[PDB]
Amino acid sequence: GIGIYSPGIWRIPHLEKFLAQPCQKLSLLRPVPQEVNAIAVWGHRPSAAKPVAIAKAAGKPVIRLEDGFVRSLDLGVNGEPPLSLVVDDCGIYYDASKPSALEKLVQDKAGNTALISQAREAMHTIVTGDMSKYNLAPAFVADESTNIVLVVDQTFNCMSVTYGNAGPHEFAAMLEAAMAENPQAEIWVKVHPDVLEGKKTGYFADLRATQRVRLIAENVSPQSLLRHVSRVYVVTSQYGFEALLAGKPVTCFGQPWYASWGLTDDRHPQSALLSARRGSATLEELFAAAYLRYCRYIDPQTGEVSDLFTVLQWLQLQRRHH
Ligand SMILES: COc1ccc(C(=O)NCCCCCCCCO[C@@]2(C(=O)O)C[C@@H](O)[C@@H](O)[C@@H]([C@@H](CO)O[C@@]3(C(=O)O)C[C@@H](O)[C@@H](O)[C@@H]([C@H](O)CO)O3)O2)cc1
Ligand SMILES: Nc1ccn([C@@H]2O[C@H](COP(=O)(O)O)[C@@H](O)[C@H]2O)c(=O)n1
Numbered sequence: 523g524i525g526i527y528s529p530g531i532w533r534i535p536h537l538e539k540f541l542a543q544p545c546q547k548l549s550l551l552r553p554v555p556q557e558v559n560a561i562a563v564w565g566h567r568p569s570a571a572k573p574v575a576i577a578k579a580a581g582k583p584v585i586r587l588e589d590g591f592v593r594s595l596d597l598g599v600n601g602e603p604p605l606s607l608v609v610d611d612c613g614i615y616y617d618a619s620k621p622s623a624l625e626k627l628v629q630d631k632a633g634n635t636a637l638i639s640q641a642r643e644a645m646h647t648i649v650t651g652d653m654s655k656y657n658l659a660p661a662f663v664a665d666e667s668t669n670i671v672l673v674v675d676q677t678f679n680c681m682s683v684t685y686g687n688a689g690p691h692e693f694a695a696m697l698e699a700a701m702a703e704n705p706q707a708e709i710w711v712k713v714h715p716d717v718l719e720g721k722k723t724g725y726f727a728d729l730r731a732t733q734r735v736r737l738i739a740e741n742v743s744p745q746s747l748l749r750h751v752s753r754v755y756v757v758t759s760q761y762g763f764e765a766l767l768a769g770k771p772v773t774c775f776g777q778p779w780y781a782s783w784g785l786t787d788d789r790h791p792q793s794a795l796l797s798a799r800r801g802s803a804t805l806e807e808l809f810a811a812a813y814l815r816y817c818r819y820i821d822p823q824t825g826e827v828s829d830l831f832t833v834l835q836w837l838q839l840q841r842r843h844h
């Protein structure tokens with residue numbers, strides 16, 4: 523069925539439930555067996571390069587996997603297995619250079635409008651229930667009473683930045699723009715939870731904070747923090763889409779999966795070309811395509827094929843406890 527080289531992918535519980543077909547472990551030192559129809563790798567991680575080369579030489583297509591957008595309770599870097607994966611037979615969502623399976627799903631407007639009730643239900647649970655990709659962080663504590671601008675940091679070796687046509691230099695450009703364009707505001711630079719855990723680095727290690735430019739190094743749930751801000755600047759973070767769900771304006775310095783559909787203030791030099799390729803989409807079309815069609819889910823108790831709604835309910839149940 524599907525060949526898996528990576529031992530890290532192979533150990534994902536219920537891998538075959540996400541892929542919807544049988545899977546088998548392959549060795550880098552043996553030929554591709556005839557019974558394998560496609561090879562699955564993790565996005566454009568460095569670990570994917572050898573299996574991608576082998577697939578090309580063997581005449582086999584590549585499927586790219588990654589975490590879903592509502593993934594788990596604890597962080598991926600803390601060894602928590604995923605409850606959702608993305609499955610991409612074309613490219614991968616974060617690679618802006620060519621269409622992905624997700625881009626094509628977004629463009630199928632009719633298939634997305636069919637899902638409008640499920641989209642509205644899940645959107646409401648995510649925002650008002652304060653859910654995200656990772657779900658263990660407590661809510662941010664603050665007075666609910668319009669002068670705060672959020673600048674989102676990411677992880678230094680994450681491929682969404684690179685394949686979104688960006689790198690460390692766009693993080694500096696983003697911060698400088700947030701400062702200059704909002705001279706009366708406080709600028710909050712939010713550090714990524716993987717970096718707060720000590721497992722990864724970010725893009726602002728050298729930043730000298732000031733009275734106006736502050737570091738947010740508390741691990742807090744995104745929707746709770748978004749209630750306290752007036753607008754959001756990103757390079758390629760998933761936070762940008764979560765900020766759209768929260769009703770905030772979003773400025774993008776990279777080319778993430780949700781840029782160039784008409785819903786974001788796009789700053790990248792390739793924005794016009796990408797917008798021409800993508801066209802327009804509504805927020806609910808983007809949400810249905812990504813969260814309901816592109817992402818696949820398993821049941822957190824039985825392991826069987828599931829849906830977003832079941833995963834959300836479980837994650838809310840586990841939170842009350844924890
Ligand atoms: C004969 O000489 C010879 C033979 C072989 C070699 C050689 O090259 N050997 C090494 C082969 C490659 C070893 C790969 C180790 C396992 C990596 O597992 C994964 C992967 O990349 O496939 C499994 C995935 O499910 C992920 O966990 C990824 C990680 C790291 O690559 O990706 C991220 C992460 O950075 O943490 C990416 C994120 O976007 C996110 O998905 C997170 C996730 O939440 C979990 O943390 O994974 O590892 C030489 C010589
Ligand atoms: N600075 C950041 C960036 C991301 N995040 C979290 O990490 C998830 C994934 O975002 P990235 O695409 O930035 O890795 C977000 O959904 C959110 O839970 C955060 O909480 N603070």
Ligand SMILES: [Cl-]
Pocket residue numbers: 688689690691692
């Ligand atoms: Cl760079």
